[PDB]
Symmetry: D2
Subunit: 217 residues, 4 copies
Amino acid sequence: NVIKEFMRFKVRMEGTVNGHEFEIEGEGEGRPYEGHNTVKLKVTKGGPLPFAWDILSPQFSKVYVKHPADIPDYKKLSFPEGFKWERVMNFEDGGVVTVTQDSSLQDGCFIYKVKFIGVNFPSDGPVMQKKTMGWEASTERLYPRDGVLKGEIHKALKLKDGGHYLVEFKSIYMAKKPVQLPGYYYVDSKLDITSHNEDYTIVEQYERTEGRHHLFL
Amino acid sequence: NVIKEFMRFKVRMEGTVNGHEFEIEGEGEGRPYEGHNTVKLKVTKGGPLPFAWDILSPQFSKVYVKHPADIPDYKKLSFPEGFKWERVMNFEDGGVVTVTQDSSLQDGCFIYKVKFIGVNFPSDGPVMQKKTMGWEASTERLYPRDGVLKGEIHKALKLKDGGHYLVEFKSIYMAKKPVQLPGYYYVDSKLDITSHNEDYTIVEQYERTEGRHHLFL
Amino acid sequence: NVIKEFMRFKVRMEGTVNGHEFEIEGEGEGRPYEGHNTVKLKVTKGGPLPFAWDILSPQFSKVYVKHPADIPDYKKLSFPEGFKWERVMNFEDGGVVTVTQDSSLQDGCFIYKVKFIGVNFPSDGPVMQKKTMGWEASTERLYPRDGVLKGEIHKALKLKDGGHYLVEFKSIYMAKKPVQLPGYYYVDSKLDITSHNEDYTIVEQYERTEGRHHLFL
Amino acid sequence: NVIKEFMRFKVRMEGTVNGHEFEIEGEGEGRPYEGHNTVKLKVTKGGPLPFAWDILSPQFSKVYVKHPADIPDYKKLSFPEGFKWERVMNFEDGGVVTVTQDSSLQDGCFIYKVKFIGVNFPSDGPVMQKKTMGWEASTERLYPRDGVLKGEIHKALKLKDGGHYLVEFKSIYMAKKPVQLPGYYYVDSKLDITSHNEDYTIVEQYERTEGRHHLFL
């Protein structure tokens, strides 16, 4: 087995939001079978960011989702080769983001390569004015489709003046080799920003993430 | 107590799907504080239906959602006056449905009046070809907004040739009198068709529905 | 040919916007082959309306669209039997409307029966606060699909304090019996509110609508 | 004065579609005040492309749009500094694309830098199976919003076996310096693939694009 009880990872993101180009690099670690992982990020180019860090936080590790024995762990089974993941984030005020990523395993460490493009965010909106205060804990709905695994989430960012800023996530997970696909299931996640410097150029995150069947089944 | 341990309801739906006009009348019952109810429906006009019954099933009782003590039960608190609910159902193949309903209390019995309009369903699609096999259990994401309660769900209809037919639900719950609104929370639901006649003109449904905080909190 | 150079019509709408029920009845007339028609409406029940009239204005006659000889006039050809039309109106601030209609012909007079359900409009939004000042002239993109005619438009309502309120229209035109379908084409339209009383309970409208190929063809 | 009657351009694209990375370089020319331009493209990395070329064709020069004297030419006025343009392409089968671009003027030649991310395209769909055969001529609806110029289009890809594959374009044009914005208007366009080799690694395109008021005004 190539996936140990403790695994480290390296991540690199090249992105663009409302015309602003940036590059982020980071290191992370966690326990794949327990559903715990952490990551320390640094904005290497284009810093400081003129937008909310929160839109970038869920783009930095679903191989770390704790899966019970009866639910095929598609993402873990895809290794050593790995998987690719794609995403559409539809924000309630017109903002749209598409993400494309490659997950590989090189010398016992997971390697993540992310590309991000965020467009149509209002200048006076919560993203461009940094009015967000982290994500609420979420629940993803997953199912097999077109030979790959897909998942959707109704997420929300908490606001400074109170209230929520709603975002719909549509994710696609694609294995680099044909492996076992699960049926209809759910993934609960809670991402927290554990520490950050004043301008968000150095950020530390934590994520608890577990897969399960619906409670009524 | 205005809402008793055991409550009955009467429901009437006037609808249109792909130009086909129909009317449905029903009678139901259940336990509001336990999170479960049943309903028997009869197609009084426009029978037999040339589309999947399943798209109509979740339009026939959220006052029956079991809520913990720490989550304000907005829908129960709205009574004797009651509440109105509205909904948008966005199907993956282009089909769209808007629903509008009024919930009142007349002489110890809940009265539900539903109006349904379903449009843009492909003639060769699972709705018009009756290829659906019930809903999978679901999880609604709720939050307060614009002085009322809103909730969204990523639902799915099971297909007989295998696979899923995806539908996004967007619901709005509006009290007739200003009552206490809850915060961010979730409602798990599971609707089953318990019995039906050959042409789906007489149908019986069961729904278990419970409110809760996200499992990681 | 059952459709003459001058044709009259009568229309009735039963609708609901944000829980508010209403009924509208009207009489109209126009010239089918010239591309223009007029209509006088009166709110028979639910008057005065607490929302903007403008959202109802495009639901009151596409058989009146002028078509050149080289573009099959599907809607005119559908008569004496007639056609049914359905619509989805997606507003930028979340408001969603579905409309279903039946168009028939009785002794030289077209009979229109409309059902309208409008949901999710913000209470402080331009619809519920009556801040709209009529529609801008529009351009519909049409094409045949699933044995019927479809069309989409990027429309906009002019705002009182300046700016626009965007709405995407998705319409489906369905002949009761199969008749010749056109290919890809466009329809230019301009609807005007010619007169109205103070509370919009009596309203007169004018529409100019003509079909054409794209100008670069 | 800076934009001459005849202007040349260089374009570079770094993109990803369904996990497949590619790079495209090209050179074009045309007449800005007349509303027409040409471009020759070469796939420099990731060739041959396993998807339809057509989705990339409209990403390679709106400074070339012929504008009448009464409609402020925002994009031409933005020069020598230039503009940035962003886009969302919503395909009817779930595919989503976000594009971000930078347009500048260097040594009397326009320089275009494009980043493209395409996600959620079905493996058996029109894009991944190359079932498309060019775009139909289109009509963009433009308006000023949030201090910038926005435009939406209901586009369509012609299918090899007949019918259309629908795509909704949402574009945002942002000048690098505060310049005069137009009002509500339209842009007609027709993009043709004039020449290509067997695997689409070398492609030549032509575009005729002109701005105008609605025909009824």
